[PDB]
Amino acid sequence: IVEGSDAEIGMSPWQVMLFRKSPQELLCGASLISDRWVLTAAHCLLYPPWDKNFTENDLLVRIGKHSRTRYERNIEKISMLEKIYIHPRYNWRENLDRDIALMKLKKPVAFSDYIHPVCLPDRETAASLLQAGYKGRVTGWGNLKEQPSVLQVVNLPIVERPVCKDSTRIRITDNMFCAGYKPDEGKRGDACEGDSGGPFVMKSPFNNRWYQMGIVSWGEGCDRDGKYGFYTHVFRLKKWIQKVIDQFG
Amino acid sequence: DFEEIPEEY
Amino acid sequence: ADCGLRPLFEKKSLEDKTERELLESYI
Ligand SMILES: N[C@H](CC1CCCCC1)C(=O)N1CCC[C@H]1C(=O)NCc1cccc(Cl)c1
Ligand code: NA
Numbered sequence A: 001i002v003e004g005s006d007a008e009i010g011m012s013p014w015q016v017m018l019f020r021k022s023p024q025e026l027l028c029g030a031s032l033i034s035d036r037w038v039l040t041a042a043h044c045l046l047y048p049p050w051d052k053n054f055t056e057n058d059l060l061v062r063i064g065k066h067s068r069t070r071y072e073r074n075i076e077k078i079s080m081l082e083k084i085y086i087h088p089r090y091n092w093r094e095n096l097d098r099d100i101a102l103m104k105l106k107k108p109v110a111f112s113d114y115i116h117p118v119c120l121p122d123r124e125t126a127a128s129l130l131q132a133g134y135k136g137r138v139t140g141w142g143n144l145k146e147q148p149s150v151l152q153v154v155n156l157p158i159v160e161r162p163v164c165k166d167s168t169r170i171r172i173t174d175n176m177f178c179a180g181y182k183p184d185e186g187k188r189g190d191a192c193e194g195d196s197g198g199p200f201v202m203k204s205p206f207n208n209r210w211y212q213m214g215i216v217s218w219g220e221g222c223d224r225d226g227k228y229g230f231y232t233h234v235f236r237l238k239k240w241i242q243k244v245i246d247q248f249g
Numbered sequence B: 001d002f003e004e005i006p007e008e009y
Numbered sequence C: 001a002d003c004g005l006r007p008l009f010e011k012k013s014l015e016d017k018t019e020r021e022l023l024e025s026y027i
C-alpha cells in the first residue's frame, strides 16, 4: 500500500496473507469469507507470463496477522489448502478479466478478536455503495512504493467508469472497477505489488457491516498521478462464488 | 526476512 | 450470520480512526 497508514489491531480481521512454503515469503493478500473459505485474485495463483502456477501444497494461509514478517504466536493461525478454485473464464492473457479465486481450507479456522469473516454484497448493497466518489478501504502488506513492518490501510474513492477507461490503454470490463484520487484532488494512495488479492471493503451505512466489494487486481505502476488501481467486481462474480461454495462446501 | 513458522504447518 | 462485524470495533461500539471518512463519502 502506498501512502497508507498502519492498521489498528483488529481493524481488518478478515485480512489473510497467502504465504509461500519455500522460499518462505509473502505471495499475496486474500480475505476470509467464512470459517473455511478464503477469497483472492486468480493471478495470485495462476499467471503464465510470469511462470506462476501454484498448487495447494505450495502455499499456506496466515489469518489474524498484523506484523508482516513476525510469527504472531497465540494470535495468528496458519491454515493448509484443501482446494483452489479459479474462475473458468479468468482472462490472464489480456486484461485480467474475472480476476478471482476461492481457496478451501483443510480445517475450519477458529474465530477470535483478530479473526473474523467479512460479508459479501447482495445486489442492493452493491447498487447502493458502488458509486463514483464513495470511498472503500484497501489493506495489505505490499510495497510501500513503486516493505512495511505491519499491515497497511488506505481509503480510496471509487472513480467514474469513463475516467477509469480514459486513464489506460487496457480494455476495461464490467467485472472491474477502479479507485483512487485524481491529481486535482490533493490526497493520494494506491495498492501496490504484494497487495494483490487483498480486499477493497466498504461499511454499509444501512446495517453497519463491512462488505467486500473488490479484490486488488492491477495497476500500471503504483500511486501514479492520472492512473488508478483496478479491482475485481465481487458482486458481478457472485453467482460463480455461490456455485463453487454450494457445490464443494 | 520472515520469522520461521513452526515445523508443523 | 455475524459477518462484517469486528470484535474489537462494531461488537464493542468502538469506531476505528478513519471509518468516518468512508461514511461521509456515502452522499
Ligand atoms: N502492471 C500490471 C498491469 C496488468 C494489466 C492487465 C493485463 C496484465 C498486466 C499489473 O498490475 N499486474 C500484472 C500481474 C498482476 C498485476 C499486479 O501487479 N497487480 C498488483 C497491483 C498493483 C497496483 C495496483 C493494484 Cl490495484 C494492484
Ligand atoms: Na439502518
Ligand code: NA
Residues within 6 Å of the ligand: A180, A181, A190, A223, A224, A225, A226, A227, A228
Ligand atoms: Na493515481
